[PDB]
Design a protein around this ligand. Structure first.
Ligand SMILES: [Mg+2]
Lengths: 101, 140, 149, 101, 154, 132, 198
């Protein structure tokens, strides 16, 4: 069991973007240039659109791995501000201390 | 042991090859840690080990780095109230000189295996070799 | 008196002028030979006597990293060479020798040469993909005055 | 200043040696070199392995609780609240037999 | 003028640890290393010595049982280089078709009764079996004397 | 008022340990860190993965030694080795501890693909820093 | 009726003051109050109190101790490790002497961190540094070599720096940097007809 249904949908989005990465790379290359005929570029613009929407990598959201919080996350640890503060304030993070200066 | 002592302890086999050895003009060892005292003890252990093996060593302290970030203290609203956290990184650089490749492997193995917890190393070997045989002679 | 190595011997056998004439692996290790070797190991099997002997055993089994640290230990990309990764124009022979397709594929092979995260086999698959793609679009290219294969 | 023939022909001689783009390429067409020289965002281990396998932990620890090798204070707490709730007659209805027919 | 470069010495991956091990000797005031270094956990008698080294082995067998019975939870590998000895073991044949190759797998896995069944089935069909493969079957049967290899399980 | 990791005053009858007595701002001043790895040092990677392993390793040790832990465990990573240092009460028989060490070591070595060792220091009872 | 086990007395009591301490702590271990024969105390003391004792001290357990590394052990260890080392050539007694016979400098970097994976992306990069004075270059070649390399050449130090990280492995990037030097040197000597129009 994952934290919630929102984390489950995101997990699937992350596994389908990995599957279609090479495909979306090879096809999208045909569009990001000025060297190929515009007829081919307009057609490659439609092959990329036909791929499933969950393959698109801009639909991935970074959520807290432990609470599935969408915002407030720190990317180095993948934890929300609330969860990070609980581990940090108890001496459980290696080298993290309070900042006094 | 007072009376019971090993007689002829078995020692590993070290076989000299026929390949020429690497020649390191310099070998910089940058250790990092959150704790200065650990760096002092590791510096003492490493400098003593180098002097005991005949290696030439010098030590300096690169400037420390402190990374600070701010967070929201409350779980809900109360924006103006924050909590700040920092991680401190301290450095000790062990600059070795004029090392063969056999001396640099045994020394690095010995000191890397004894690297305390919370300490990261960044070895920067600088090898010196002759010129390529093709480059030595211009050929058209 | 009872000299261990002075006196009469059986003499059924003769001095081994020829020694170990048949190779030790005359056949692939059988269950009988594979199991006898395991039993010889147990004869000298004693528990660890200190932390060194434990680390020695972990190293022999691959559990513990080898030292000095090598960040590329066991990491060989199919035994390739630098020239294989960098010079990739041999694979563009099927493509038109000149024209827009050549200009595009040149940019593709330039990026692939600067890609450290792909193997040569993976890089070839990217090139092969475009070869089949343009073949399928032969009719659209012909309208644009580009002839492919 | 402008690039004379000597300057331009030297620049092409350099690019040929250093494996750089040799022709005059627009800024738009230089993205193709970027796309195929950089690992895509969806192929980076941080993206596709952003989450821990929550199913493995929950299933493994649940199995260990049934083998007697792990004790889950939280689960024992919930198990007794269900037991007491069922005695009070507030238990979960059977599927298809809910209050609304 | 030409400099003479020394010839590089070489040694095994464990050679350095073996050198350091030679320096230290046994601690006379400590129990054998297997036993836990704590006054509460030090074996007082010879019975507690063997019992402590039989409860430890039992806990290792309890873990290996769980790992080999729920392998799907112990399949993610995050160790580079890859550690083969820390992966779940599989001992049951996964080749379903009845061929000389399938018999060879059972022989390799050392299953005695299953291999005999597939060998007899191969003879029933009459499919050719290599003399070398037929010998690998006899080796397993002759060595284990027609009885399944000894093992411990629930 | 700040409520984070502060064991609040009772009426002089609550036995707090050294670790519990000190609030978060005493970290790196009076009390150290329970986990020591290299993943939060500058220019180092895999902080997220080391932290997740720690969270699990603490929940695993509590359940595997239920009611037998006198204080929080200390995790020490060197190279790929993991070392768990736990203060454990002398409640269980001696032979039972040998079982849980063999089990918890093998299970966590096949789960994270590293050599894991458990270090247990047995106390007669919880050590009280002060009564608050 | 139930019997609670009694802990033995600490083994420090049986330790002589002239013992072989390296044997007590052969390798890195956590602090064991029952094995370290020292009355060490750690902890901020309460008012009218002394720092806490070693037994049951979490603070001492949280320390990365150096008991396994003592001046007596380090000297005994290095005595064994001497056979591994090889002797630096005496002739190369100066930095300038090395540049004479070994003008090419190859930089390789290793990284040691804690974790299950030994892989670091930064370990592939290689850097070659050679001085153009060390290379046999005619007046024409040196000008051609300096124009092709661009900013890789430093006029102040007269050092050409080639940084190669494009290839996946370090052995490939190293062989590539040596290759880049060979082509640049050989190309610089070659004279092209278009060069007469400078
Ligand atoms: Mg977004």
């Amino acid at each position: 069991y994952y934290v919630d249904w929102r984390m489950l949908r995101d997990l699937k989005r992350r596994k389908m973007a990995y599957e279609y990465a090479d495909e979306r790379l090879r096809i999208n290359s045909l569009r990001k240039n000025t060297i190929l005929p515009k007829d081919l570029q307009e057609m490659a613009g439609d092959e990329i659109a036909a791929l499933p929407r969950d393959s698109c990598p801009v639909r991935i959201r970074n959520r807290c791995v432990m609470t599935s919080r969408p915002r407030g996350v720190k990317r180095r640890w993948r934890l929300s501000r609330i969860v990070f503060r609980h581990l940090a304030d108890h001496g459980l993070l290696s080298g993290v201390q309070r900042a006094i200066w | 042991l007072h009376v019971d002592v090993p007689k002829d302890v078995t020692r590993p086999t070290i076989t000299t090859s026929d390949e020429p050895d690497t020649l390191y003009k310099r070998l910089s060892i940058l250790v990092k840690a959150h704790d200065r005292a650990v760096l002092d003890s590791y510096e003492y252990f490493a400098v003593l080990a180098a002097k005991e093996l005949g290696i030439s060593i010098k030590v300096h302290e690169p400037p420390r780095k402190i990374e600070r970030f701010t967070l929201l203290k409350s779980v809900h609203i109360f924006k103006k109230h924050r909590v700040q956290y920092e991680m401190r990184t301290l450095y000790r650089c062990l600059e070795l000189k004029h090392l063969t490749g056999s001396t640099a492997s045994v020394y690095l193995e010995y000191i890397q295996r004894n690297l305390p917890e919370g300490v990261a190393m960044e070895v920067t070997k600088t090898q010196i070799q002759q010129l390529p045989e093709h480059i030595k002679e211009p050929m058209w | 008196r009872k000299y261990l190595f002075k006196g009469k011997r059986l003499s059924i056998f003769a001095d081994k002028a020829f020694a170990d004439e048949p190779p030790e692996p005359e056949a692939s290790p059988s269950l009988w030979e594979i199991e006898f070797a395991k039993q010889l190991a147990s004869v000298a099997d004693q528990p660890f006597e200190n932390g060194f002997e434990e680390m020695i055993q972990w190293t022999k089994e691959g559990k513990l990293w080898e030292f000095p640290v090598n960040n590329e230990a066991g990491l060989d990309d199919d035994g390739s060479e630098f020239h294989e990764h960098i010079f990739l124009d041999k694979y563009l022979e099927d493509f038109p020798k000149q024209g827009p397709i050549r200009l595009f594929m040149e940019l593709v092979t330039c990026g692939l040469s600067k890609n450290p995260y792909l193997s040569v086999k993976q890089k070839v698959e990217h090139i092969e993909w475009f070869r089949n793609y343009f073949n399928e679009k032969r009719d659209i290219l012909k309208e644009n005055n580009i002839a492919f294969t | 200043s402008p690039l004379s023939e000597y300057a331009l022909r030297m620049s092409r001689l350099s690019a040929r040696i250093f494996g750089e783009v040799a022709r005059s390429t627009d800024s738009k067409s230089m993205k193709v070199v970027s796309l195929f020289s950089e690992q895509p965002l969806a192929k980076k281990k941080e993206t596709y392995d952003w989450y821990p396998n929550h199913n493995t932990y929950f299933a493994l620890m649940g199995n260990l609780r049934f083998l007697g090798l792990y004790r889950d204070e939280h689960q024992d707490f919930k198990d007794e609240q269900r037991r007491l709730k069922k005695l009070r007659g507030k238990g979960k209805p059977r599927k298809g037999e809910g209050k609304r027919a | 003028e030409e400099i003479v470069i020394p010839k590089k010495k070489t040694w095994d991956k464990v050679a350095v640890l073996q050198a350091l091990a030679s320096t230290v000797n046994r601690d006379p005031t400590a129990a054998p290393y297997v036993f836990h270094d704590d006054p509460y956990l030090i074996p007082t008698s010879a019975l507690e010595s063997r019992s402590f080294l039989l409860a430890k082995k039992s806990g290792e067998t309890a873990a290996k049982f769980i790992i080999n019975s729920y392998p799907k939870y112990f399949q993610k590998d995050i160790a580079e280089p890859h550690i083969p000895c820390l992966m779940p073991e599989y001992f049951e044949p996964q080749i379903e078709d009845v061929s000389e190759a399938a018999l060879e797998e059972r022989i390799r896995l050392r299953k005695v009764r299953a291999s005999v069944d597939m060998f007899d089935q191969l003879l029933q069909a009459g499919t050719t079996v290599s003399l070398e493969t037929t010998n690998s079957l006899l080796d397993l049967l002759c060595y284990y004397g027609d009885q399944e290899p000894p093992a411990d399980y629930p | 008022k700040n409520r984070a990791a502060r064991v609040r005053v009772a009426k002089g009858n609550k036995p707090v340990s050294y670790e519990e007595a000190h609030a978060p701002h005493y970290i790196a001043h009076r009390k150290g860190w329970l986990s020591l790895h290299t993943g939060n040092l500058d220019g180092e990677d895999h902080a997220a993965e080391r932290t997740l392993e720690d969270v699990f390793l603490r929940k695993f040790m509590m359940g595997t030694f239920p009611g037998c832990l006198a204080d929080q465990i200390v995790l020490k990573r060197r190279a790929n080795q993991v070392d768990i240092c736990a203060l454990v009460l002398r409640q269980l028989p001696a032979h039972k501890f040998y079982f849980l060490v063999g089990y918890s070591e093998t299970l966590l070595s096949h789960f994270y693909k590293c050599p894991v060792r458990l270090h247990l220091q047995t106390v007669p009872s919880k050590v009280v820093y002060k009564y608050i | 009726r139930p019997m609670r086990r009694k802990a033995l007395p600490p083994r420090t009591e049986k330790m002589d003051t002239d013992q072989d301490w390296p044997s007590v702590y052969p390798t890195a271990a956590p602090f064991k109050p029952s094995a370290v024969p020292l009355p060490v105390r750690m902890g901020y003391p309460v008012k009218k109190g002394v720092p806490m004792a070693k037994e049951g001290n979490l603070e001492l357990l949280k320390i990365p101790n150096f008991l396994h590394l003592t001046p007596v052990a380090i000297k005994r260890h290095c005595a064994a490790l001497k056979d591994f080392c090889t002797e630096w050539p005496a002739a190369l007694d100066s930095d300038e002497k090395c540049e004479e016979h070994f003008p090419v400098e190859i930089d390789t970097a290793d990284y040691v961190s804690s974790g299950p994976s030994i892989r670091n992306p930064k370990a592939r990069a290689v850097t070659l540094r050679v001085k153009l004075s060390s290379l046999n270059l005619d007046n024409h070649a040196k000008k051609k070599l300096i124009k092709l390399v661009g900013e890789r050449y430093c006029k102040a130090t007269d050092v050409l720096t080639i940084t190669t990280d494009r290839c996946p492995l370090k052995r490939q990037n190293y062989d590539y940097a040596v290759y880049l030097l060979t082509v640049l040197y050989h190309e610089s000597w070659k004279t092209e007809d278009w060069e007469n129009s400078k």
